[PDB]
Amino acid sequence: KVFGRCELAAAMKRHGLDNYRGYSLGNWVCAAKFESNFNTQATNRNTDGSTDYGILQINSRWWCNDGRTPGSRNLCNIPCSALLSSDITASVNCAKKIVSDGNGMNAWVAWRNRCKGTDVQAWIRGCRL
Ligand SMILES: [Cl-]
Ligand SMILES: [Cl-]
Ligand SMILES: [Cl-]
């Protein structure tokens, strides 16, 4: 599914991301835009052989099992393909575990480089929330 901007904001709000660990909703929308272009089916392979999955590009080296990342963990206890669903529940629930790990949203490279320190509230401007 390719979400619209406000449709995803609303979905993320419903699932408890707004101000989760102190990160306002626009941070999560901005991260999804630059990680996946709001496409739940996005995948990208990394140099180490791990793969990033879904709307928040969650990595198989630590967080999910894809059957092809040797020596990796599955901290979210889920197949990586669950992260590609039109229902963002699994992605959100795994993201809450990531953002609680100590480095906050700096785990998302696109957030660090394209959202951090910018006016992220712009990403929810106009939406009915
Ligand atoms: Cl915001
Ligand atoms: Cl894994
Ligand atoms: Cl933090």
Work out the end-to-end distance of the chain between its first and last CA atoms, rounded to an integer number of angstroms.
20
**Structure tokens that stand for 109 in this block:** 């490279």
Task: Name the resolution in angstroms.
Answer: 1.5
Half-sphere CA count of 60, side-chain side, radius 13 A: 25
101 annotated binding-site participant: yes
Q: Ligand 1 centre from 79 Cα, in Å?
A: 30
Count of CB atoms within 10 A of residue 78's CB?
A: 18
When computed from its CA atoms, the radius of gyration of the chain, rounded to whole angstroms, is 14
Strand-by-strand arrangement of the 58-59 sheet: 43-45, 51-53, 58-59
Where helices occur in 5-73 by DSSP H, the ranges are 5-14, 25-36
* The two three-digit tokens of residue 22, written as one number: 């102190």
- What top-level class would CATH report for the domain 1-129? mainly alpha
Distance between Cα 74 and ligand 1 center (Å): 30
**Known catalytic residue at 87:** no
**Phi and psi dihedrals of 53, rounded to 5?**
-125, 135
Kindly state the DSSP code that residue 60 receives in the 8-state scheme. T
Instruction: List the determination method.
Output: X-ray
Q: In whole angstroms, what is the distance from residue 1 CA to residue 56 CA?
A: 13
7's CB contacts (< 8 A; 6+ apart) are: none
Q: Considering 18, 35, 48, 66, which one is annotated as catalytic?
A: 35
Q: Name the catalytic one among 7, 18, 48, 52.
A: 52
CA angle, 125 as apex, 119 and 128 as ends, to 5°? 145
